[model samples]
Target: HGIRMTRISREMMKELLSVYFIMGSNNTKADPVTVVQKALKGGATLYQFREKGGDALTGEARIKFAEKAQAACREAGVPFIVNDDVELALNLKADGIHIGQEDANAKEVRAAIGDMILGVSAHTMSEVKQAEEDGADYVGLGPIYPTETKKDTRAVQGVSLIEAVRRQGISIPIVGIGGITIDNAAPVIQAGADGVSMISAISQAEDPESAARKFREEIQTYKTGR
Candidate 1:
């Protein structure tokens, strides 16, 4: 009966951004719940439940699945984020929600979520600026490489956009996403992202835990080199 506002500091935000893992029932051939557990075990710092496309569950089943994922994330001490589903986010009192430009008004969602973390998808400098102004805790910038997971993704922005935002002195926490993998994840951080987000790189991998571990190792190595 009280407001549940999340207060994630900038430093904490950066820390959690290290390896953002996103998945859904249909996102992997393996059990989605197991995937979350394995990814977390392998060092996924953040988790997003994106229940969309490809025979994804619906209705009560979807909510039940999300609850399971939320519990898994909680056990791993990771933040659980719902992708573009405000109602589910609110109902679950999820750690946060990630919304695209067309999903909803960021300002409105911000007021509703209180101090809870809110992440927005930004494709350009202006959108990133808008997200900041709208009180987004962080921004998801991506499709840094071509992606096979989402057919409706915006144009690939590469690391150039991340660099551009930093060049302009915009300091909002950023996670580079879309088609990211262990091999190419480091560049996004070198370009100024707080972290790299991935879908298939882990979910669709033969070994999700190993894939996640490699990504974390790769990012840490890159961070050390810089």
Candidate 2:
């Protein structure tokens, strides 16, 4: 199996970074295809479709959006992920599915999707271990700081969360999420995250592409200085 690598500049460490863009209903009017195109152009390495509602219409709409986004991802050589929708993801042949603690368990998702990359959301040491044991390819830990992305999100995980995971010896690729911005990303990266995932940082930026470039540039600088 291919394990994810983290970048450390001490010697020969190289990090693999990724951006997660969520195209929800509010942004659907912007056209999923175009949004994905812009995101890919903005250097998004992975995409996720997070439908806010669970109604049939929302499900159908998100699936359609995902199909369009997946096409763009395929064209750009990026991975397309479905947020909390295993059945739709499988039916659409998406690259992966991201599940939160309140959502389906990683093991159940794995059993359903079989071999596809499964990412789980972890906010603590226990969740991280469970995700790893459940065969998740990676874990998204957050909110590294407070944010509105998840209305009921738990308290900020901070560096202690990373420390906890490290103490447990779980090496799965971990992405620090929640309130990550160009200004604060370096510290999160330095704290031992393999990468960082964002929403408002890019989605709400005046220039999504420029914002993403800034993040990439900052990470590169951090990489070089390490």
Off by over 4 Å in 1: 1-6
CA-lDDT, candidates in order: 0.90, 0.71
Q: Per-residue CA lDDT of candidate 1, range 1-226, in tens?
A: 1234456889988888899999988888898899999999999999999998769999999999999999998888888999999989999989898999998999999987888889999999899999999999999998899997988989987898999999999989999999888888878999989999999999999999999999888887776776
Tens digit per residue, CA lDDT, model 2, 61-159? 656766777788788777777888888888887777899999987888888886677788988777888887898878888888878866788988676
- TM-score, candidate 2, is 0.85
List candidate 2 segments past 4 Å from native.
1-17, 27-32, 54-59, 224-226
Instruction: Looking at model 1, report the run of 10 residues with the lowest lDDT sum.
Output: 1-10
User: lDDT: which candidate is best?
Assistant: 1
Whole-structure CA lDDT of model 1: 0.90
Q: Which ten residues in a row have the lowest lDDT in candidate 2?
A: 5-14
RMSD of 2: 4.7
